């Protein structure tokens, strides 16, 4: 008798489908100003690829999605 499969079959593919340091001078410190070069954090912007009344409705749903 038997109830379960075998392994050699159950392997096939169609089936599966350091250290640290404490500086009292600089232990609990954090940067107060940070250098950025991105106009996004800086400023809000829409999604590049868009469309107006019909061309590539896929881009229209992308607009609806990413612009909120």
């Amino acid at each position: 008798r038997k109830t379960r499969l075998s392994k050699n079959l159950l392997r096939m593919k169609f089936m599966q489908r350091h250290w640290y340091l404490d500086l009292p001078e600089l232990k609990e410190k954090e940067s107060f100003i940070i250098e950025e070069q991105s106009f996004l954090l800086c400023e809000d912007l829409l999604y590049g690829r868009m469309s107006f009344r019909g061309f590539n409705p896929e881009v229209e749903k992308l607009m609806l999605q990413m612009n909120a």
């Binding site: 590049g48 690829r49 868009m50 469309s51 107006f52 009344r53 019909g54 061309f55 881009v59």
Partner: peptide
């Protein structure tokens, strides 16, 4: 422009 004639455009930064 979305009122006169249709289009689809990519803006690259």
């Amino acid at each position: 422009v979305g009122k006169l004639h249709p289009l689809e455009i990519v803006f690259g930064m």
